[PDB]
Design a protein around this motif. Structure first.
Motif, PDB file in Angstrom:
ATOM      1  N   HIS A   1      28.283  44.220  35.795  1.00 14.19           N
ATOM      2  CA  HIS A   1      28.571  43.692  37.149  1.00 14.19           C
ATOM      3  C   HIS A   1      30.071  43.808  37.431  1.00 14.19           C
ATOM      4  CE1 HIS A   1      24.623  41.386  37.041  1.00 14.19           C
ATOM      5  NE2 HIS A   1      24.942  41.270  35.730  1.00 14.19           N
ATOM      6  N   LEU A   2      30.776  44.692  36.706  1.00 15.79           N
ATOM      7  CA  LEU A   2      32.242  44.896  36.793  1.00 15.79           C
ATOM      8  C   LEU A   2      32.985  43.746  36.094  1.00 15.79           C
ATOM      9  CD1 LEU A   2      32.730  46.244  40.410  1.00 15.79           C
ATOM     10  CD2 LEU A   2      32.026  47.386  38.345  1.00 15.79           C
ATOM     11  N   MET A   3      32.263  42.817  35.480  1.00 10.95           N
ATOM     12  CA  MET A   3      32.861  41.622  34.835  1.00 10.95           C
ATOM     13  C   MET A   3      32.961  41.836  33.330  1.00 10.95           C
ATOM     14  SD  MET A   3      33.477  40.309  37.639  1.00 10.95           S
ATOM     15  CE  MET A   3      34.098  38.632  37.400  1.00 10.95           C
ATOM     16  N   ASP A   4      33.990  41.245  32.719  1.00 10.63           N
ATOM     17  CA  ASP A   4      34.252  41.316  31.258  1.00 10.63           C
ATOM     18  C   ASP A   4      32.947  41.007  30.530  1.00 10.63           C
ATOM     19  OD1 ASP A   4      36.942  41.467  32.135  1.00 10.63           O
ATOM     20  OD2 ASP A   4      37.464  39.443  31.415  1.00 10.63           O
TER      21      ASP A   4
ATOM     22  N   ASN B   1      29.314  36.432  38.173  1.00 11.55           N
ATOM     23  CA  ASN B   1      29.010  37.804  38.653  1.00 11.55           C
ATOM     24  C   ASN B   1      29.122  37.854  40.177  1.00 11.55           C
ATOM     25  OD1 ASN B   1      28.717  38.827  36.054  1.00 11.55           O
ATOM     26  ND2 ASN B   1      26.575  38.113  35.933  1.00 11.55           N
ATOM     27  N   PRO B   2      29.566  38.993  40.760  1.00 10.53           N
ATOM     28  CA  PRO B   2      29.616  39.159  42.220  1.00 10.53           C
ATOM     29  C   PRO B   2      28.216  39.347  42.838  1.00 10.53           C
ATOM     30  CG  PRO B   2      30.161  41.228  41.122  1.00 10.53           C
ATOM     31  CD  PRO B   2      30.006  40.186  40.024  1.00 10.53           C
TER      32      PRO B   2
ATOM     33  N   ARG C   1      31.650  46.266  30.356  1.00 12.91           N
ATOM     34  CA  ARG C   1      31.705  45.670  31.706  1.00 12.91           C
ATOM     35  C   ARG C   1      30.288  45.656  32.285  1.00 12.91           C
ATOM     36  NH1 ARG C   1      36.102  48.996  31.893  1.00 12.91           N
ATOM     37  NH2 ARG C   1      38.112  47.947  31.976  1.00 12.91           N
TER      38      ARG C   1
ATOM     39  N   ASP D   1      34.484  47.186  47.562  1.00 15.63           N
ATOM     40  CA  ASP D   1      35.921  46.873  47.402  1.00 15.63           C
ATOM     41  C   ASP D   1      36.061  45.429  46.912  1.00 15.63           C
ATOM     42  OD1 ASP D   1      36.762  49.299  48.312  1.00 15.63           O
ATOM     43  OD2 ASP D   1      37.890  48.568  49.963  1.00 15.63           O
TER      44      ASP D   1
ATOM     45  N   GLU E   1      42.294  40.915  41.474  1.00 15.19           N
ATOM     46  CA  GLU E   1      43.058  40.715  42.721  1.00 15.19           C
ATOM     47  C   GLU E   1      42.697  39.410  43.419  1.00 15.19           C
ATOM     48  OE1 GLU E   1      43.128  44.201  45.087  1.00 15.19           O
ATOM     49  OE2 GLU E   1      44.542  45.077  43.751  1.00 15.19           O
TER      50      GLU E   1
ATOM     51  N   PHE F   1      38.971  51.327  48.656  1.00 16.36           N
ATOM     52  CA  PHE F   1      40.302  50.810  49.047  1.00 16.36           C
ATOM     53  C   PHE F   1      40.867  51.585  50.236  1.00 16.36           C
ATOM     54  CE2 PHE F   1      39.490  49.130  44.869  1.00 16.36           C
ATOM     55  CZ  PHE F   1      39.826  47.810  45.005  1.00 16.36           C
TER      56      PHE F   1
ATOM     57  N   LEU G   1      42.443  50.571  35.607  1.00 10.74           N
ATOM     58  CA  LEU G   1      41.929  50.245  34.258  1.00 10.74           C
ATOM     59  C   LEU G   1      42.755  50.976  33.190  1.00 10.74           C
ATOM     60  CD1 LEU G   1      38.160  50.399  35.186  1.00 10.74           C
ATOM     61  CD2 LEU G   1      39.817  48.575  35.460  1.00 10.74           C
TER      62      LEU G   1
ATOM     63  N   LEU H   1      41.872  45.508  25.332  1.00  7.28           N
ATOM     64  CA  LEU H   1      40.834  45.033  26.288  1.00  7.28           C
ATOM     65  C   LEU H   1      39.662  44.443  25.503  1.00  7.28           C
ATOM     66  CD1 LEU H   1      40.916  47.922  28.899  1.00  7.28           C
ATOM     67  CD2 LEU H   1      41.882  45.620  29.132  1.00  7.28           C
TER      68      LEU H   1
ATOM     69  N   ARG I   1      33.885  43.415  45.214  1.00  3.61           N
ATOM     70  CA  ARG I   1      33.521  43.176  43.795  1.00  3.61           C
ATOM     71  C   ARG I   1      34.550  43.816  42.864  1.00  3.61           C
ATOM     72  NH1 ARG I   1      27.699  46.011  42.973  1.00  3.61           N
ATOM     73  NH2 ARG I   1      28.072  47.937  44.128  1.00  3.61           N
ATOM     74  N   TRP I   2      35.072  44.975  43.235  1.00  2.00           N
ATOM     75  CA  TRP I   2      36.161  45.578  42.434  1.00  2.00           C
ATOM     76  C   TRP I   2      37.397  44.665  42.455  1.00  2.00           C
ATOM     77  CZ3 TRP I   2      36.414  48.404  38.440  1.00  2.00           C
ATOM     78  CH2 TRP I   2      35.421  49.346  38.190  1.00  2.00           C
ATOM     79  N   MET I   3      37.738  44.136  43.622  1.00  2.00           N
ATOM     80  CA  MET I   3      38.922  43.248  43.718  1.00  2.00           C
ATOM     81  C   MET I   3      38.735  42.017  42.818  1.00  2.00           C
ATOM     82  SD  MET I   3      39.789  43.317  47.811  1.00  2.00           S
ATOM     83  CE  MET I   3      40.308  44.811  48.643  1.00  2.00           C
ATOM     84  N   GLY I   4      37.511  41.491  42.737  1.00  2.00           N
ATOM     85  CA  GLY I   4      37.212  40.311  41.919  1.00  2.00           C
ATOM     86  C   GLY I   4      36.873  40.629  40.475  1.00  2.00           C
ATOM     87  N   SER I   5      36.950  41.896  40.078  1.00  3.91           N
ATOM     88  CA  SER I   5      36.510  42.351  38.737  1.00  3.91           C
ATOM     89  C   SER I   5      37.391  41.728  37.639  1.00  3.91           C
ATOM     90  CB  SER I   5      36.492  43.868  38.646  1.00  3.91           C
ATOM     91  OG  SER I   5      37.782  44.424  38.794  1.00  3.91           O
ATOM     92  N   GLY I   6      36.776  41.444  36.487  1.00  2.00           N
ATOM     93  CA  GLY I   6      37.476  40.982  35.271  1.00  2.00           C
ATOM     94  C   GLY I   6      36.817  39.730  34.711  1.00  2.00           C
ATOM     95  N   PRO I   7      37.537  38.593  34.549  1.00  7.45           N
ATOM     96  CA  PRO I   7      38.902  38.434  35.052  1.00  7.45           C
ATOM     97  C   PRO I   7      40.023  38.976  34.152  1.00  7.45           C
ATOM     98  CG  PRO I   7      38.293  36.473  33.878  1.00  7.45           C
ATOM     99  CD  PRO I   7      37.069  37.369  33.884  1.00  7.45           C
ATOM    100  N   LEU I   8      39.717  39.534  32.960  1.00  2.00           N
ATOM    101  CA  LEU I   8      40.769  40.007  32.010  1.00  2.00           C
ATOM    102  C   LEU I   8      40.805  41.535  31.911  1.00  2.00           C
ATOM    103  CD1 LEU I   8      40.258  37.174  29.367  1.00  2.00           C
ATOM    104  CD2 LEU I   8      42.071  37.323  31.037  1.00  2.00           C
ATOM    105  N   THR I   9      39.667  42.214  32.067  1.00  2.00           N
ATOM    106  CA  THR I   9      39.602  43.687  31.878  1.00  2.00           C
ATOM    107  C   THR I   9      39.456  44.430  33.210  1.00  2.00           C
ATOM    108  OG1 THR I   9      37.193  43.865  31.630  1.00  2.00           O
ATOM    109  CG2 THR I   9      38.401  43.306  29.659  1.00  2.00           C
ATOM    110  N   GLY I  10      39.448  43.701  34.317  1.00  3.99           N
ATOM    111  CA  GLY I  10      39.298  44.285  35.657  1.00  3.99           C
ATOM    112  C   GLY I  10      40.586  44.266  36.460  1.00  3.99           C
ATOM    113  N   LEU I  11      40.471  44.417  37.775  1.00  2.58           N
ATOM    114  CA  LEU I  11      41.599  44.368  38.740  1.00  2.58           C
ATOM    115  C   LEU I  11      42.133  42.942  38.952  1.00  2.58           C
ATOM    116  CD1 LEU I  11      40.400  47.102  41.221  1.00  2.58           C
ATOM    117  CD2 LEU I  11      41.323  47.271  38.927  1.00  2.58           C
TER     118      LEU I  11
END
Ligand code: KZN
Ligand code: KZN
Ligand code: MG
Lengths: 449, 448, 449, 458
Positions: free
Chosen positions: B178-181, D317-318, B176, D285, D299, C338, B297, B383, D287-297
């Protein structure tokens, strides 16, 4: 205006600008501070793109004609010919992607003038990712600022402080503890303390270099080295060390730590913060020593630039900024997530500014303040000789009560302890003049020769 | 409820107390925090007084009877038998003179119980000043805290992290950024990164020891050594190193620097703050990995003490405390004047607390969270099988040009590399399905 | 050494301990600092549990006999009778759920001794959650500290500074800018500036009270109020206001903001940090004024406790601690996720300690330092009247050239400007003795009321 | 180039420079940062010099033709026409005297081009000193940044968050406490919390203005007003308020406090630091909500603003939450520098003004700029993954509680166990255990498991 494009589509760009579409997107996305990368950061990015094209050439992954154009444009950027072509804000994507693309697009445009077609991401970014390039440039700039600029600047300030320690070795004066009069010292001894603080500062910078010099290059997107040669890191570092003379640059001990965190910048900022703390004490003492000319301590005179202590004020203000920059660096440092810390541009701005401020102000302080200080030698000695603090050595000869009466009278009549003991008629029964002179020798009391 | 006499009147002291009049005046002068010296600081003051009496006896300045009694009482103090005879607030005279005098008086009272009369100042404070003693005990305590407690605790945490990096060497998962895949990594690789951060933390502590271990003792009131033997510092340090086993204790390089400044505590706090920054990243990733089981996660399960990540929360709170403590230390560090930094008791409380918090929480984190973590291996692999892929490992089968065409079409049609190769009809003599899967294998992409 | 049975296994609990199995497990799980909740926090948890039982009784949700037992037990906790019954470390689960359970268990055990059986969760925690209680108690404790303890303490220090400003109204002395001699001020005017700093500090604390007094109670687990009466918040607040007289306590403006963040603590710490800044300036000037008795400024004498400035040293050390605590609070503040901020116990320790240290040190500073200061009046006036800074009003009479000569000679010969003007034979047609006296009236130059 | 004479000798100055000798010495004395005063500080010094010349004319102390020339030149500076004529380092003399002389000299040079002789000190600095001017210009600049720029930018973000709160009023999702599954909330409720944080941030800025707006002007060298008219302060303030409309500007409550300390700048930095803390929570909150789009939250989806990667071509990227968290970090650092300068004044003057001014004005600018970008280029365009959020909420063991009174806490616990193990909704698991019957109808179950009702939306 001219039309350009990237994966997301088409973008209008200033017609005569060396940057392209990704850089233009970043210009529109981040109008936050109005300040972009510093000259040292641009130079670092240039060196790194040159070293990368060299190794990619050396492994026969990049055509020689492309590697040569990249290396020549990268030389131009490291030299400082293209700073006007780096307009992206410090407050950008937290990986430094945007500035990395800025370097690739500008290098492609320079090569295009010399009639060589480079693709910014397939040639100029070959074997690299944004994630490992922007931190690598940051650590090169920091290593270079510590070794080639800050340590020599602190060595000059140390030497100016140690020269005063020697010149003033017998300049006896009142000690002060809690701001109250104490047993004697010399200005020399005090300046030997200040000199040790700066020598210790150099030791603190040197102690951080084994981790500040760690470069992420070769780790690619997440630290694994995917899409790069297995030895890309060691080859690129070897080129940077040969080209800069910075033996402190080295491959990361762990490729994941080197991208998931910037702990080496936090560590380094700690050393600079400790130097800021030392310089605050040194500058405060020096401005207090120069205070007056009538109502202050009036121990020394500062060179003019009744003189205000303008360099001490610059030094203490610089120290305040380094402390503020230190808190921002630690804040970004803590907040990495998983494979990447996305506070690099902000942490880079702060640590490189702290290096620069301490460098410049340390040289000005050494040259234009420390070098030209003059001591009020006879005045300092008269106060040391007139202080109630030096009566203690007399208690065995004249008793506690009489020692106290001598101190009270010396203060009230503004006379030396020596002349008060004589005035009170204590010579003879209690002690001789020879005994008095031995007991009240303020230079001997300071344990100086 | 015994009454004592001070040169500015009468002083009532508790009857069980071993401290005397000066300490009682200090109890009355500074009711600020209601907290006194910690065990570590009491111990170091005991160690210091025992060593000073030893050297004063060795130099024939102190009658051996008196030295023996001081040494006996000091050993009791150093062994924690009197941690209740030190009632003075942390927020006292900035030299720590009050706590120095507290140590002198308690030693006098203990000696008097064994029939020996000691004067707190002339005997127990012989060859010492009110300004070189408390900073010395502070640097003894901080050096012992770094060498005998923190470094072993961090080594325990490093070793738990390294054990996991090895267990999980082939536990593939998605990266991950930037928190992105992002492209695949292994849970092992991430733990190898955490382990290196703690190893670098130990290197950071080790690097500050040459300055942390510097003791002011022998400098006296202003750093000149007046009223002390010329070799007092070197002889006292030698006794302290002998008794503690702490080879890191050393004479000050410059006796003036050692009392005018506490730069060594500021340097040391920087190392602890860096450790606190590393620990925040490690604890944060671990709570995020254990997040859910349904809305998170769900990568790992933390040991239960729906498990809340209570030890990551304790670690991140400690880290916040070390950051605040660090700002207070630097602030005190900067504000010395002439021959004496007068922020010592406040700087001591803050650095010794940061050492203790990091030591205790690192051991707890290692033993009660890291050691017991379990990987959700099948979830993590699923994942990884959803991470982006690259066309680079197809180059040798289809050529730069076809691979380039595959990447373009995958992006345009929002398809995987794998499906795009299949949809373009590339399976055949040049590339079998077995070869495509082996080329794009997620564990191979992680390059473990 | 009595025994309790837990789901996980048996647990041994000290004999005279009123806590139960959950508190004992917390003692085992978090041996980190060895420091537990402060007296104010424990009192606030008692206050809250009493008010919650009062409201659960009033709404008919809780049997009156159980409610009476809780209210009697909670009163004892709020009265400081059971400070030794809260052994859990500050560094616990970040909701402070462990301490919430500690209060529930202690109340159940106090009630057991009076023949009443309370279930810690079902009765003492009825209508409350693990997440809205500890922050509510933190905000009660902080609001009480600000209103009942800090403001009165600051008002005492203000009034001591104001009293000195009045007594020293005509105590003319040399102004200092950049630590260098400047045109005259009075000690009174400087003290009026210190008084304003402390008055502005009280304004800063009063300004944060609208958000500091916001209580999360009734928000339950995530802020929605699920499992609580719809009006629980307003009812419990109305009881706490009626019982404590703290009209500053209020329901949260937004029930999610009140649990997702502790922004009101961060805001209040900023007010305490500003006071720490003001106190540093006041205490530093005061110790500098009392420096001596020979080689320093020697403007005033501090009362004893050659006197070291021990209370200015206590004040500046407390200021440093408040600054450090302020940094810790903000760090915790930023890091919520949150529905819940899980840094509450650390933030609570730091804010309540800053309130305590400032309260206690301000009163000691006012009573044992400020009230007893004594000015060297005649000496201050003599230096003011002898300063080169005051020759400027001579220019229109003798010219700026002769005025500079008077300044240089007065300083060299340690004489008043008045006596130097006379000694140099300048009295006559161009300047009368009365005209000289009007020109060099140092108290007039200070322009006091 | 063009030669000049100082009282320490001869000084060389760029030809197309409006500054004179003393500014050129300061350029040589302080090559520390290579960064000078910002546009807001330069404008503030322009506003102040024009107000001072107006008042000196009004009181008959300055010839009208000299005052009109200063007013005309000072208005040019306040309008931003001479932003390149202020070359002195931020890291100068602590009073700001160098930057004050810079202003006096540039005003004198502008007036000379129109045939009027102004003495920088005697005319442009009339009734003022080297110490009450720069802090006055700093407080003007900081008050203007707060009222004209930051508060409206915050209101724009507040309004963008509040509009999402309303659009997502019914978007049910599971709550998260300690990052673990919790009872239901709405995305609208969470956004209403973010809105309230920014609204409180505006309240925090408002609450500092009574002290941020205090001006030292008229206090002169030490705070006594010596060498200035007794009412110089109230007269300059009256002109600045009439001309700028900035009602928050006022004469200091105490003239000594206003020069000996900058506590108003420390107070205001605390408000900005609190906003930085709020923005950190909101951006983290988001960037976490928008995380992934497959391995994250996964939301919500953030609007795309540029490509993220070359290695992974489609990755977005956020970047705005990243800019916001970085700005927050910088505001916290700046806040520590301000407090450090604030505490270290001595006697009649705090000599950290230029450093405190750089840091507070930058915090104001970064917060203003990033708040607007965050509202317009991120919050406005957010989309919720409504079906994904509801599915998770309807499958959450957290929602079994209201079955208690119908089937018992034990049977409820088994429903949770089973639903969690078998990846089914609570409603389906309850049906799959034959629980529907006499004491639980199918509509009673739907009423009990209504996840939106459990969120308790107003
Ligand atoms: C910043 O401290 C000073 C600045 C200037 C000067 S000076 O050279 O210009 N000077 C002026 C005063 C004076 C009085 C009589 C005889 C000679 C002099 C000479 C002295 C001083 N300090 C002192 O006079 C120190 C002092 N000594 N003895 C005292 O009883 C006393 C009482 C109160 C405060 C201080 C003291
Ligand atoms: C902390 O400042 C002080 C502390 C003590 C004293 S005192 O009362 O004890 N004192 C000692 C000196 C002296 C000399 C001649 C006649 C009488 C006296 C009396 C003076 C001072 N300041 C001064 O002497 C100020 C001063 N004035 N004039 C100068 O040309 C000068 C040059 C260099 C440094 C300072 C100055
Ligand atoms: Mg999910």
């Amino acid at each position: 205006y001219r039309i350009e494009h990237d994966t997301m589509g088409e973008v209008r760009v200033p017609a005569k600008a060396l940057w392209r579409a990704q850089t233009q997107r970043a210009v529109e996305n981040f109008p936050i501070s109005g300040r972009g990368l510093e000259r040292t950061q641009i130079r670092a990015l240039g060196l790194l793109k040159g070293a990368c094209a060299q190794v990619n050439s050396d492994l026969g992954l990049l055509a020689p004609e492309k590697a040569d154009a990249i290396i020549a444009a990268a030389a131009e950027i490291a030299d400082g010919q293209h700073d006007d072509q780096f307009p992206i804000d410090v407050f950008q994507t937290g990986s430094g992607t945007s500035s990395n693309m800025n370097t690739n697009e500008v290098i492609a445009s320079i090569a295009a003038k010399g009639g060589v077609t480079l693709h910014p991401n397939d040639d100029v970014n070959m074997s690299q990712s944004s994630n490992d390039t922007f931190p690598t440039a940051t650590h090169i700039a920091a290593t270079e600022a510590a070794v080639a600029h800050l340590i020599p600047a602190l060595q000059q300030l140390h030497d100016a402080l140690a020269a005063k320690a020697l010149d003033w070795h017998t300049v006896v004066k009142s000690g002060r503890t809690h701001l109250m009069d104490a047993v004697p010292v010399t200005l020399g001894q005090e300046f030997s303390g200040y000199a040790r603080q700066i020598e210790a500062g150099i030791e603190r910078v040197r102690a951080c270099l084994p981790r500040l010099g760690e470069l992420a290059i070769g780790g690619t997107a997440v630290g694994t080295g995917l899409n790069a040669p297995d030895d890309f890191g060691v080859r690129v570092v070897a080129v940077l060390v040969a080209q800069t003379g910075l033996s402190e640059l080295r491959t990361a001990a762990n490729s994941f730590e080197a991208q998931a965190a910037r702990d080496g910048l936090v560590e380094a900022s700690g050393a600079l913060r400790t130097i800021a703390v030392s310089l605050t004490k040194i500058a405060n003492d020096i401005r207090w020593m120069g205070s007056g000319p009538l109502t202050g301590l009036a121990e020394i005179q500062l060179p003019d630039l009744k003189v205000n202590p303008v360099l001490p004020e610059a030094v203490t203000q610089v120290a305040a900024q380094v402390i503020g920059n230190d808190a921002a660096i630690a804040w970004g440092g803590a907040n990495g997530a998983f494979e990447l810390n996305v506070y690099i541009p902000m942490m880079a701005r702060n640590i490189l500014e702290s290096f620069k401020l301490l460098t410049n102000v340390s040289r000005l302080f050494a040259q234009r303040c420390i070098a030209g200080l003059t001591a009020n030698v006879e005045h300092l000695r008269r106060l040391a000789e007139s202080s109630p603090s030096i009566v203690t050595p007399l208690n065995s000869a004249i008793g506690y009560e009489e020692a106290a009466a001598v101190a009270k009278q010396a203060l009230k009549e503004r006379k030396t302890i020596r002349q008060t003991v004589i005035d009170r008629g204590l010579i003879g029964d209690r002690l001789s003049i020879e005994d008095l002179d031995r007991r009240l020798d303020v230079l001997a009391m300071a344990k100086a020769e």
